[PDB]
Amino acid sequence: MKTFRWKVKPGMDVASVPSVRKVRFGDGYSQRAPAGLNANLKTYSVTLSVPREEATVLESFLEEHGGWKSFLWTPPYEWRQIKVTCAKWSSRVSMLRVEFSAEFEQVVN
Amino acid sequence: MKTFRWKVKPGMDVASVPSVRKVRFGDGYSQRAPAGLNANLKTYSVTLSVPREEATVLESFLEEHGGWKSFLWTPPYEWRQIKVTCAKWSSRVSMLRVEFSAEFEQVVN
Amino acid sequence: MKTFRWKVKPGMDVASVPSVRKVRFGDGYSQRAPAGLNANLKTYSVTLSVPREEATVLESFLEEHGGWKSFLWTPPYEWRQIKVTCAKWSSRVSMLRVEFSAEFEQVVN
Amino acid sequence: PNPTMPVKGAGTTLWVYKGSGDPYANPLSDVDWSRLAKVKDLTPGELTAESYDDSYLDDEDADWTATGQGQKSAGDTSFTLAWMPGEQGQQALLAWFNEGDTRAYKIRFPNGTVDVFRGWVSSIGKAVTAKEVITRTVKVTNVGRPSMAEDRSTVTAATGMTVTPASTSVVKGQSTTLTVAFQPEGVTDKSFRAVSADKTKATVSVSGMTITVNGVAAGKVNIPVVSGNGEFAAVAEITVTAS
Amino acid sequence: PNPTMPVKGAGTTLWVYKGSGDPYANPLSDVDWSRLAKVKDLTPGELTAESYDDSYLDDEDADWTATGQGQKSAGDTSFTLAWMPGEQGQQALLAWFNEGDTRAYKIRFPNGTVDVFRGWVSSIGKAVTAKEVITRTVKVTNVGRPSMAEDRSTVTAATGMTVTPASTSVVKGQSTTLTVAFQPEGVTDKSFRAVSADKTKATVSVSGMTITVNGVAAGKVNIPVVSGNGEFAAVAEITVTAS
Numbered sequence A, B, C: 001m002k003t004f005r006w007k008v009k010p011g012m013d014v015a016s017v018p019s020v021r022k023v024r025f026g027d028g029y030s031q032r033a034p035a036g037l038n039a040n041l042k043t044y045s046v047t048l049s050v051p052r053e054e055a056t057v058l059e060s061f062l063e064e065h066g067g068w069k070s071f072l073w074t075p076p077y078e079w080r081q082i083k084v085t086c087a088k089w090s091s092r093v094s095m096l097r098v099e100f101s102a103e104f105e106q107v108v109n
Numbered sequence D, E: 001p002n003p004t005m006p007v008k009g010a011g012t013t014l015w016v017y018k019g020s021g022d023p024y025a026n027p028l029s030d031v032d033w034s035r036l037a038k039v040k041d042l043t044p045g046e047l048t049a050e051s052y053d054d055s056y057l058d059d060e061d062a063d064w065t066a067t068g069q070g071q072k073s074a075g076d077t078s079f080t081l082a083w084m085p086g087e088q089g090q091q092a093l094l095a096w097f098n099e100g101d102t103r104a105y106k107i108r109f110p111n112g113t114v115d116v117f118r119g120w121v122s123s124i125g126k127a128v129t130a131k132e133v134i135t136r137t138v139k140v141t142n143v144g145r146p147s148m149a150e151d152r153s154t155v156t157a158a159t160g161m162t163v164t165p166a167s168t169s170v171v172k173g174q175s176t177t178l179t180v181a182f183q184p185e186g187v188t189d190k191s192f193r194a195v196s197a198d199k200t201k202a203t204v205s206v207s208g209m210t211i212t213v214n215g216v217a218a219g220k221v222n223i224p225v226v227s228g229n230g231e232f233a234a235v236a237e238i239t240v241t242a243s
Helices: A052-065 B055-065 C055-065 D090-099 E090-099
Strands: A012-015 A021-024 A030-033 A043-051 A071-073 A082-086 A090-093 A097-106 B013-015 B021-024 B030-033 B043-051 B071-073 B082-086 B090-093 B097-106 C021-024 C030-033 C043-051 C071-073 C082-086 C090-093 C097-106 D013-017 D033-035 D039-043 D047-053 D067-073 D076-082 D103-108 D114-127 D135-142 D161-164 D175-177 D179-182 D192-194 D203-206 D211-214 D219-227 D232-240 E013-017 E033-035 E039-043 E051-053 E067-069 E076-082 E103-108 E114-127 E135-142 E162-164 E175-181 E192-194 E203-206 E211-214 E219-227 E232-240
Touching (some): A043 A052, A052 A090, C055 C082, C055 C090, D211 D219, D219 E219, D232 E219, E175 E232, E211 E219
Antiparallel strands (some): A043 A097, A082 A097, A090 B013, B013 B043, B043 B097, B082 B097, C090 C097, D114 D135, D161 D179, D175 D211, E013 E033, E051 E067, E114 E135, E192 E219, E203 E211
């Protein structure tokens, strides 16, 4: 399975911090270069809230990929399908629902 | 003893954080591998609340294994019995109850 | 694209931190010099709030420059147009709006 | 005692379980129950449920918030009763508070119905003032699922709907009475309506049963009668003569 | 029933959906709705809204604060009604509370207009006092966007319906179709429901303006049709031949 089809909660953080080449000694003249070709691949701090029964399915999805094996995902932010990778996906199992805190880092390959 | 019979009330934290081998190439490309051979182990941040008379039994059970050694436990997350080890089990005493906080780490052994 | 048109709501932080050469002598005496030749550049801790549709445009503008490159901006502090660069621009998504937080660093270039 | 009609609330009794079986099984019997008599006033607990957020970033039409029912709680039941320390039933209540176990208690209404909750005493009060009876005020916090009266009700759908009209002649300025068999083996819990298929010759009035068919104009008129949402229905015929 | 002039609010009824179609589509039709009777009082929902800050540093005229509208809630609808635990509608209400689903419920005003909301039960109480009928108090937390009465500002009122059925022989293994004419000036905002008489001779199937009668058994079968709230109706007769 190659598509994350679950829904994320309202408050989701998107961090960019692009990669550039910076040369500046002290506080003198500065030079900046775009460095690589795929400058910024962003990062989404995704949070989900799902019934206790579907927690097993969600963790099976996240566990099968297991850090490697990026999967397709359409963020609700720019609505463009991308390839992402997750590595932590902590979870908290309340009385009736479980919350997932995962980090999706977009990739190219 | 082999089985953990006490129950976890509030909603635990179930952390996966699988180990992967990641190489970052230049203009946005990368290379990922699952590093290991048998999945990730996953750890539970468990907390019990027990009557002051039963805290001694729980302490004896957690101290017999003594950091090493594994016991069976069926987490209220996937309902699949697993082998776990506990290594800290802090405990806070109150007027009529004792609250245990512990970290159960799943082990293949 | 050259000019930044969005507006900053809350009250930013404008940090100067001039660079000086300081030598501390013995019984209370010292020796100070301005180190550099052209003033201090100052940095603005800026936050935007935008509708969920214009967030894509703002992201495109901030990603085109991509950490390097400079854009013109007239801060609501001194009303003097300056050249600035942005390198982080974290963003938090919500139900109807998106909140951008960023650090604009003034550059001579 | 009619559980399908409003009742006046005078005659409500409060009982505490002192047996060892399952109180929710047969609450209607007061065998293993102790009566808490002389109740000045009663206030049953309120069944509440928390809410969880149900808004998702991928949703369309996000202008209006959405939520969902969370975890249910059976509230606190309060009651003030006459202070008679030396009578058993109040000493049992004091022991219940003193050792603080979870115990069952039921409320009997003048309907033949009963509401049995299960909880522990959380407050014990007194009110001393001259010129009026000393009152002991008690509050109980309920735990777990209660067994409400609606859980003990019943329904019957024995398919016993029938329309028995006169199906005879009628003249101007008169009326005819119809009948509906509301006994699907006796007990029923459904409603019905009736309306003429033309509403141009004879009208119909659904007055407590007695469909009153009124011959405004002559002719053969058909009146459908449908019970419930359309589970069963029939058609009555009335022949209004010229004279 | 004039909706452009103030009304006194007496006779306002309350209904809960129990069908499967769109509840906002045809709220004037009381077909798939269960009525909660003996409503003591009713406080409707309060459509509110939150405010986002709309003051920027670059803006001129910083002396006066500015805001903007955000996400609008649908509020909570509370009501208390006479407690009849043995009557269907209160059992359905308690099942709605226990299950926790989000259902639709409409309020019909003495105006011809209807306000239908969607929500879940968040409170179930009860007041037990002597000399006063026991009342059940319910609170429903609304989700999503409701369907206000100002949305249905057209209402053609129909006032017309007729049937042109086949009324011919029906053979075994085959079914006939019964024509319905429902064009009183074309524009219509009403529905109907057709049923059989004995459910043995022939059976009816109605879905989308079409009525199909299949001749399970021979003889003469009667089919009554009732439209909308029950103002209009019709009757048809179908003959089924054994051979």
